[PDB]
């Protein structure tokens, strides 16, 4: 497990914590064995989409700053995929991530902007920005997967007859193929559209710079599924679709 | 170009940014370009692009 930029953890903390805010407070933290085990759990869930689903470890003894849950709700929308032809999350977990992102989009600590809520109390049922731009799309819906990496982008396809006659499918993350510098995709572009409408230019630039690390990591994972895992024990195509 | 910049997410060929210093702006105002004579390759270019 490697950072996007190696050795950045050992530089001085005053350099790393540049300013104030939830993301600034979160940056500078270091993980321990529990979070390492949970991270490799997440990666195993990514490596096996059709068999592993995830949910939160919620206990009555929790007490921490809300920013960590806040960032988790912000980032799980890009990290996980839902809808389309396969899902990686429970309805409860998707709902929790969505309400966390609702909390983030309503969290305002530098600048006060206008807000236009909707008829219901549903998360993201409002319009934001100087131009009215709808955030209600990212509310979770497993029919198409608007809020995750299955949004209007192909993920499964077929090229040639496989040696194993029940595993014809090719599983590609973010629609890219191994056989790419600077390429983007629909979900990420619309996330940046949301963020520039929210006017959070700090994390807009942060994510804009962090794109290539995400893309190369997902390409590597894509390679791992489409190459190493091809065996007789892979799930049949009809059962994977159903 | 401008609506793409104000939307914040580019779909096609993006513009390019460059870095300048503070005193460069005053120098840019206090100096001015003046064309001596036209390019040597100006007249023959259509053959090249054709």
């Amino acid at each position: 497990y490697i950072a996007p930029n190696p050795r950045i953890s050992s530089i001085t903390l005053t350099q790393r914590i540049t300013t104030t805010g939830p993301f600034a407070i979160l940056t500078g933290s270091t993980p321990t064995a529990q979070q390492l085990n949970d991270v490799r759990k997440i990666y195993l869930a990514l490596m096996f989409p059709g068999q592993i689903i995830l949910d939160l470890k919620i206990d009555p003894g929790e007490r921490m700053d809300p920013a960590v849950r806040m960032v988790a709700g912000v980032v799980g929308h890009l990290l996980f995929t839902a809808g389309g032809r396969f899902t990686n999350l429970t309805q409860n977990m998707a709902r929790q991530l969505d309400i966390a992102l609702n909390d983030y989009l309503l969290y305002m600590y530098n600048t006060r902007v206008q807000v236009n809520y909707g008829p219901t109390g549903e998360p993201l049922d409002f319009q934001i920005g100087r131009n009215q731009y709808d955030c209600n799309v990212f509310r979770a819906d497993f029919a198409t997967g608007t809020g995750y990496n299955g949004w209007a982008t192909i993920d499964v396809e077929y090229r040639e007859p496989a040696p194993y006659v029940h595993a014809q499918r090719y599983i590609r993350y973010c629609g890219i193929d191994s056989r790419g510098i600077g390429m983007t995709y629909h979900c990420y572009n619309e996330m940046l559209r949301m963020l520039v409408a929210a006017g959070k230019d700090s994390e807009a630039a942060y994510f804009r710079s962090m794109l290539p690390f995400h893309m190369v990591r997902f390409a590597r994972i894509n390679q791992i599924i489409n190459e190493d895992l091809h065996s007789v024990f892979s799930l049949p195509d009809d059962m994977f679709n159903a | 170009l401008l609506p793409d910049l104000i939307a914040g997410a580019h779909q096609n060929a993006d513009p390019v940014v460059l870095d300048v210093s503070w005193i460069s702006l005053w120098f840019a105002f206090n100096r001015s370009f003046e064309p001596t004579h036209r390019n040597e390759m100006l007249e023959v270019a259509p053959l090249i692009e054709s």
């Binding site: 996007p4 510098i181 710079s209 290539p212 690390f213 | 370009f33 001596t36 390019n39």
Partner: peptide, 28 residues
């Protein structure tokens, strides 16, 4: 001083490639 098209093209391309190498400094 003076300036011209070929030398200025080489110039601007050199700084563009410098910036792109700064981009790929993240490319391990």
């Amino acid at each position: 001083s003076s300036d011209s098209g070929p030398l200025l093209s080489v110039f601007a391309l050199q700084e563009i490639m410098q910036k792109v190498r700064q981009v790929q400094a993240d490319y391990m």
